[PDB]
Design a protein around this ligand. Structure first.
Ligand SMILES: [Zn+2]
Ligand SMILES: [Zn+2]
Lengths: 81, 208, 24, 100, 96, 216, 125, 87, 129
RNA sequence: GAAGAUGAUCAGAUACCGUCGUAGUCUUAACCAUAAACUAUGCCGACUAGGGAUCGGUUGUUGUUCUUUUAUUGACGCAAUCGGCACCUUACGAGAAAUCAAAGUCUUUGGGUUCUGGGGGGAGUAUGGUCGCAAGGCUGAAACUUAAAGGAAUUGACGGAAG
């Protein structure tokens, strides 16, 4: 591959490369709106949350931190912002 | 550019697909990623036979440029390609080199089978390294039949295919003969059926 | 001779040299 | 000069490996460098499997094997001809011999 | 890269380094230590006058087998006794 | 009579190929020495060194004579040949054959001004053979071949009249001396210069225009 | 052992590559033939050549011998190895009238502007 | 190379590789000269009329010659939708 | 650590040019790099090069043509007087008719031929041929 | 199991082999500061050629068994990237060669920086200083002597080596 277009990489390989090794680095994390089972209230939760985030509605933890993404509790739904 | 008559006719695609040309090696070496379309879930790769076709028209277009028909020499160490390259030279006037290739043919000028071809076509670089290796000494361009695992060093023009199929070697060798003869004009046009039938150029077991 | 034994022979010789200087 | 790239042993990314005693001559040898052969032999010789199967008071008694892992140093293994000297080009090969 | 300082403010480190490593050179070491002025019998001279003390015939080194006819001369400038060759067929007779 | 057995021999015997540059332009391998003899009739041989190598056999020593020979036309073509044979005359004779087969063109250029005929290299080029590395530096029109005697003899036969030389390594190895020098003198055309930047269209290969007279 | 040497073996095949039609499967005929064909100074030598030239001749009948070509064996094979059945065994006639190609590889066909019927096969292993 | 008075003092102007622009040496025995045929629209090969590519043994030795053909043939109109600039 | 982006730039350029690649990515970019390329670009030794903004030090994508022999830095940036240039040209450049000495001066980054025209001198910065 | 004593072997063996065995081997308090302490390859930085395995993490996914009957189990399987310990081929290139993905990007000689060597011995010796209980470590010559010493590989010769 003597000649290839570095300025316009294929999207498939960009989704596979490291978040730092892209042409312009951009986080793969995001923010979540978690609808808990008990009630419906908008709450922004980081995908890679380090804290056991509770909702102001109910004193119930929404996610438990893990090595990577925050693991959502059963009965809770999320939607990506 | 290219008149539209040279496009892959749907007649040929049915031949190519049945003859297992679209079946590639398990592992693709870095230079054949362009020619891989997708991988079958078993693990093996699928050739982009759409890409394959115009390569054949491209490679055959090289052979026509040589003024002397005897200057083009084809080779095959694989048994499945011995008869096909033999028939290929017969219909085309080439100088076939079947079976073993004796070292020193291209460099030693006191040998018997001392040939000076202006173009060498190779059934398989993996099994025909010596023909490719010596062609590197005496300024001979090389056209090869390469799978996805077939190494691509010292190969000017490669034709992706299934080199490990009995039907595939013959058909691509069948296609080259038809497309070379069309350019020179022996076959009437790109719509006329060839007198030779694709079952010729296929190696036969000694049972018959 | 072997280097390790030549080294050891000198080691025992240096120790004798050190002692004979202690007499003065 | 350097005879082997592995320096005759299998120690990389490491400082020290505890040694082993040769089975034959009781010589200390590093565990990775020691030639290790795992043998599983029948406890009774193949000729005697019959008459010892006739003296058996138990019908269809599956006799045990003997399990043993052997350690040799270079001199232990070479002299016992477990390994043999190979050519300079055949030294690169480390795939097992195909005898069994 | 190359193991020696290259920075623009490193001219001193180069000046000391070279001067230290000139001592490994025997031509430099012999000149500075003045070993000629001290231990060389001429004392760094080109020629010297001396007084002959006794005439000696020397067995040759291998593989040559001969006699090299030299003499014991004491030097007048510093009183040292060192051997000197007499080079000429039959020039041992000229020196007494 | 001389009977060619190669395409280039076929074409050289006729009037198809007359300029060695045409062989040089298309990298035509020259396997036959009489191809050179007709197309470069004015060549100069001079043996740099004759050496005796020895192979130890069960009974005793087996002595062969090795000779090194330099060919050049003093006009831009120079060749080097090293051949071993039992006899010096045979080794010298056989060396001349292969010294002609390796003859290459050289690029004469200008140091500073381009006034008159080219007198030196277009650039500084170095070659390495074994431990010997020989650098040739272009010289002004006055300074001749500033080089060791063995390296100078190569330059005199190549047609470089002004040049500098700087050698490194075991320069007393004559064989590696001449090969490393030969590598440098052969890199004159391997170095791109601004005046060569423009693209010229690829001329048709001489074997493809006279394939009828080159087939057999 | 009765191994023939190379000097009789190369002289035998140079005869076939020159006088195959005049050669026979009978030693006696070849014995007399090689006398007027080749100047053989020894009578013992002459019988050894013909005895192995006949063996080479008596071999060509069972099939082609390896390394010997006599300007006719390939000619006999040029129009002998011309076989082809009426069906190419590659036209889509053995099957129902459409390809058995992989369903995933059909996308390759569907990527091109082709409408070819396919009985999709999905091994998935 | 040209002198003051104007005639070409340069003999043997060499060719240049179509992939890497490197000069083709006089003894570059791995260097080829690929020839491809121009075709009349009737599908028949024109006689004595070919597009010429020079290819260095450096590119062939690395095995990049096939890609250099694919890009050159794509950009010269010889070849359709097989070589892509973006990889 | 990363001590000179200019050195890391020309090296990756040379490690691409010998390899025969027609493009090379430079990281990180800087004004000294960008002005260095322009002196190279106005002489045709390289092609259209692009600057990528990532709200950071920057990156450069260069296009290569194959007319570059060797481009390198002279480190340390020796102080070069007008009578010091002829020595730097003789040692670094293969011939008197081509090749350039990139000097950084109070008047800007320039090669030794443009430097001699305007008769200004600064610190040597590299070379190209 | 050094030392020592012992029974053999031998011309002789206070050696190898055998039998005992004292310091030691272990540990707690402190010294010593050296090893083929070796990847015989300084450390940091960037680039260069392909390939597959494997460890820790993390990111999307199964004709898989199990939790439990399923998930939010686990294991396995398939794609990825980070970091590693490495391995296979090739030689663009390097090397005196063996070889080397660095030992490349080094006469087309410049990323930063530390240390070290200048023919072989004498000699890591003498002396002085300095650290240590000592054993010793660190620093460290000269006189004198010598045309070689040595590295990689080739042929042969030889082996109480294999086939
Ligand atoms: Zn809630
Ligand atoms: Zn042992």
């Amino acid at each position: 591959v003597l000649v290839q277009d570095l300025l316009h990489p294929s999207p498939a390989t960009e989704a596979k490369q490291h978040k730092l090794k892209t042409l312009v680095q951009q986080p793969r994390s995001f923010f979540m709106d978690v609808k808990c089972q008990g009630c419906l209230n908008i709450t922004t939760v980081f995908s890679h949350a380090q804290t056991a985030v509770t909702c102001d509605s109910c004193s119930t933890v929404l996610c438990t931190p893990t090595g990577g993404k925050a693991k959502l509790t059963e009965g809770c739904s999320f939607r990506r912002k | 550019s290219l008149p539209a008559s040279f496009d892959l006719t749907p007649e040929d695609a049915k031949l190519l697909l049945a003859a297992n040309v679209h079946l590639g090696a398990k592992n693709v070496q870095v230079h054949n990623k362009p020619y891989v379309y997708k991988t079958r879930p078993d693990g093996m790769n699928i050739i982009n036979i759409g890409k394959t076709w115009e390569k054949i028209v491209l490679a055959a277009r090289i052979i026509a440029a040589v003024p002397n028909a005897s200057d083009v020499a084809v080779c095959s160490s694989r048994t499945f390609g011995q008869r096909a390259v033999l028939k290929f030279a017969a219909h085309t006037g080439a100088t076939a080199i079947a079976g073993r290739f004796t070292p020193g043919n291209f460099t030693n000028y006191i040998t018997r089978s001392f040939k000076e071809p202006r173009l060498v076509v190779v059934t398989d670089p993996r099994t025909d390294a010596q023909a490719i290796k010596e062609s590197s000494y005496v300024n001979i361009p090389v056209i090869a039949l390469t799978d996805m695992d077939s190494p691509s060093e010292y190969v000017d023009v490669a034709i992706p295919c299934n080199n490990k199929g009995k039907h595939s070697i013959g058909l691509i060798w069948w296609l080259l003969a038809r497309e070379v003869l069309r350019l020179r004009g022996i076959i009437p046009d790109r719509t006329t059926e060839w007198s030779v039938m694709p079952d010729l150029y296929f190696y036969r077991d000694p049972e018959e | 001779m072997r280097d390790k034994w030549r080294k050891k022979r000198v080691r025992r010789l240096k120790r004798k040299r050190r002692k004979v200087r202690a007499r003065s | 000069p350097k005879k082997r790239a592995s320096n005759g042993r299998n120690k990389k990314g490491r400082g020290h490996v505890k040694p082993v005693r040769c089975l034959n001559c009781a010589r200390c040898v590093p565990k990775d460098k020691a030639i290790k052969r795992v043998t599983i032999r029948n406890m009774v010789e193949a000729a005697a499997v019959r008459d010892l199967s006739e003296a058996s008071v138990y019908a269809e008694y599956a006799l045990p094997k003997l399990y043993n892992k052997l350690h040799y140093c270079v001199s232990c293994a070479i002299h016992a001809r477990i390994v043999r000297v190979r050519s300079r080009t055949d030294r690169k090969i480390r795939t097992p011999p195909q005898r069994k | 890269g190359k193991g020696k300082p290259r920075g623009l403010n490193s001219a001193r480190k180069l000046r000391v380094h070279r001067r230290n490593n000139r001592w490994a050179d025997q031509a430099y070491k012999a000149r500075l230590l003045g070993t000629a002025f001290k231990s060389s019998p001429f004392g760094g001279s080109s020629h010297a006058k001396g007084i002959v003390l006794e005439k000696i015939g020397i067995e040759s080194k291998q593989p040559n087998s001969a006699i090299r006819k030299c003499v014991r001369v004491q030097l007048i400038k510093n009183g040292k006794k060192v051997t000197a060759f007499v080079p000429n067929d039959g020039c041992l007779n000229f020196v007494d | 009579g001389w009977t060619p057995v190669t395409k280039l021999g076929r074409l050289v015997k006729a009037g198809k190929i007359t300029s060695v540059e045409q062989i040089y332009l298309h990298s035509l391998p020259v396997k036959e020495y009489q191809i050179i003899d007709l197309l470069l009739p004015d060549l100069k041989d001079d043996v740099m060194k004759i050496r005796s190598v020895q192979k130890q056999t069960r009974a005793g020593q087996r002595t062969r004579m090795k000779a090194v020979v330099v060919i050049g036309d003093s006009n831009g073509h120079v060749g080097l040949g090293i051949k071993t044979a039992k006899e010096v005359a045979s080794a010298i004779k056989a060396a001349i054959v292969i010294a002609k087969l390796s003859i290459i063109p050289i690029r004469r250029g200008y140091w500073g001004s381009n006034l008159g005929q080219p007198h030196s290299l277009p650039c500084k080029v170095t070659g390495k053979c074994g431990s010997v590395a020989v650098r040739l530096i272009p010289a002004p029109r006055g300074k001749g071949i500033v080089a060791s005697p063995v390296v100078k003899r190569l330059m005199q036969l190549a047609g470089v009249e002004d040049v500098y030389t700087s050698s490194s390594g075991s320069t007393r190895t004559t064989e590696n001396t001449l090969k490393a020098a030969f590598a440098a003198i052969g890199n004159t055309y391997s170095f791109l210069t601004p005046n060569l930047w423009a693209e010229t269209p690829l001329a048709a290969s001489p074997l493809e225009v006279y394939a009828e007279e080159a087939a057999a | 052992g009765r191994v023939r040497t190379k000097t009789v073996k190369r002289a035998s095949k140079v005869l076939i590559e020159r006088f195959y039609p005049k050669l026979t499967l009978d030693f006696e005929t070849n014995k007399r033939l090689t006398s007027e064909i080749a100047v053989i100074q020894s009578k013992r030598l002459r019988n050894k050549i013909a005895g192995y030239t006949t063996h080479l001749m008596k071999r060509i009948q069972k099939g082609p011998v390896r390394g010997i070509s006599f300007k006719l064996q390939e000619e006999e094979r040029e129009r002998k190895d011309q076989y082809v059945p009426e069906v190419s065994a590659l036209d889509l006639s053995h099957t129902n009238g459409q390809l058995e190609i992989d369903a995933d590889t059909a996308d390759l066909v569907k990527s091109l502007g082709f409408k070819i019927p396919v009985q999709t096969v999905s091994i998935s292993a | 190379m040209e002198n003051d008075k104007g005639q070409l003092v340069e003999l043997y102007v060499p060719r240049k590789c179509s992939a890497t622009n490197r000069i083709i040496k006089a003894k570059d025995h791995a260097s080829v000269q690929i020839s491809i045929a121009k075709v009349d629209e009737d599908g028949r090969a024109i006689a004595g009329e070919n597009i010429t590519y020079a290819l260095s043994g450096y590119v062939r030795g690395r095995g990049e010659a096939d890609d250099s053909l694919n890009r050159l043939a794509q950009q010269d109109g010889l070849l359709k939708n097989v070589w892509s600039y973006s990889r | 650590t990363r001590t000179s982006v200019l050195a890391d730039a020309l090296n990756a350029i040379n490690n691409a040019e010998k390899t025969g690649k027609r493009q090379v990515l430079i990281r990180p970019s800087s004004k000294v790099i960008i002005k260095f390329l322009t002196v190279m670009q106005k002489h045709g030794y390289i092609g259209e090069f692009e600057y990528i903004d990532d709200h950071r030090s920057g990156k450069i994508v260069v296009q290569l043509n194959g007319r570059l022999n060797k481009c390198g830095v002279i480190q340390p940036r020796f102080n070069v007087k007008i009578n010091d240039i002829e020595r730097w040209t003789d040692n670094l450049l293969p011939a008197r008719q081509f090749g350039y000495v990139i000097l950084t001066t109070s008047a800007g980054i320039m090669d030794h031929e443009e430097a001699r025209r305007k008769h200004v001198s600064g610190k040597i910065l590299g070379f190209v041929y």
